[PDB]
């Protein structure tokens, strides 16, 4: 079975940079190689086949080259919308084999998150559970610390976070943190706070509400 | 103009069976070799198999992980390709894509689990008292996926729909948020349209400031 090993597994580059990804076949595969782009949430799209032929309507800034065992995928000028995982595929023999993919990220200037806190709805409190949500909107880079406090007590092990992929225009991330408490625990405390630490903030930002109010 | 529409994906018992369909238009179907590829959540593309044209005696080739369990077939008169899946394992859990080698379909999720279908609750993330954030919490569902739109798809700018999180309960939760002008909060209606097709659950939730 023909191994396709891609390099590198992940890449960070600036907008306008020439980007290069290589794929090494474990045998001669002639020019029987395709490159696929998979953007966040979407099906993979064919960019290059026969190692170097561009599929119809694909932008000229995408190119492939190589023969036998060594293959190159090039973006001449990386654009914001090029956020994706790129895959090579071998197709001379069954079984066809994919590379493990190269996740392409964009470096840009620091952007501080906008922070929002959301109390649990009255509708949810009827169910015996309370979800408190902290939103960090449109920040770069990805590294961000969210701390939950309930009446000054740091909360640990009772929250989960989710982060979007890099936005296809502004190259920012967004992050939601959900603190899950019992209705009884929620009703027993007053002050609910999320504290956000980020390179873009001169010092940590806290958003809070008082349950009663 | 070229379309591949996958259907037949859903929740199935381990040891169970399922047939996927791929409805093709915009190309001379009978001349193309149809492929299935699958992707487990947060993982790479894995080739499933290929069926060649009538000229090639409808010859079929399979990945080793599926051979003996999965059958690819085609009906050229219907412009349709099929993936029959028998003796399903938890490891078969993935989004399944159909291709004519040049174009791929949207793909369809197969979940192999003994876990029960559960429909979500939808709760407001109400805006505070000039940019405002608001949203919908889609809580406690299985299996994936849910879809969220805002005002039936008329509101797309400033929308972030987060990846679903698997909770300790073994149920999913997902938040969708939008940032809007704070001046618009009094006047403009904001509705998140939630659909969990596996549980036949469709909700429209109006989100507004708490009084």
Author numbering:
A (entry chain A): 1 to 213
B (entry chain B): 1 to 129, 135 to 216
Authors' description from the paper:
Covalent attachment of methoxy poly(ethylene) glycol (mPEG) to therapeutic molecules is widely employed to improve their systemic circulation time and therapeutic efficacy. mPEG, however, can induce anti-PEG antibodies that negatively impact drug therapeutic effects. Antibodies that bind to the repeating ethylene oxide repeats of PEG are termed “backbone-specific”, whereas antibodies that require the terminal methoxy group for binding are termed “methoxy-specific”. Here, we determined the first co-crystal structure of the humanized 15-2b anti-mPEG antibody in complex with mPEG, which possesses a deep pocket in the antigen-binding site to accommodate the mPEG polymer. Structural and mutational analyses revealed that mPEG binds to h15-2b via Van der Waals and hydrogen bond interactions, whereas the methoxy group of mPEG is stabilized in a hydrophobic environment between the VH:VL interface.
The final model of h15-2bmPEG was refined to a resolution of 2.08 Å with an R factor of 21.1% and an Rfree of 24.5%. The structure of h15-2bmPEG contains four copies of h15-2b Fab in an asymmetric unit, which all share nearly identical structures with small root-mean-square deviations (rmsds) of 0.161–0.417 Å for Cα atom superposition. Each of h15-2b Fabs shows that a hook-shaped mPEG fragment corresponding to 7 ethylene oxide subunits (about 300 Da) was bound into the pocket formed by the VH and VL domains of h15-2b Fab. It forms a van der Waals network with aromatic side chains in Y32H, W33H, and Y102H from the heavy chain, and Y36L, W50L, and Y91L from the light chain. In addition, the PEG backbone wraps around R101H. The terminal methoxy group of the mPEG fragment is buried in the VH:VL interface pocket, where V37H, W104H, L89L, and F98L create a hydrophobic environment to accommodate the methoxy group. It should be noted that the co-crystal structure of h15-2b Fab and mPEG was crystallized by using a 6:1 molar ratio of OH-PEG6K (15 mmol L−1) and mPEG2K (2.5 mmol L−1) as a cryoprotectant and an antigen, respectively. Taken together, h15-2b is more likely to form a complex with mPEG2K instead of OH-PEG6K. By contrast, the mPEG chain is clamped by aromatic amino acids in the paratope surface area of h15-2b to form the first CR-like structure and then bent into the VH:VL interface to form a second CR-like structure. Structural comparison of the anti-PEG and anti-mPEG Fabs reveals that the h15-2b HCDR3 loop coupled with these conserved residues assist to form a tunnel-like structure for capturing the mPEG deep in the VH:VL interface.
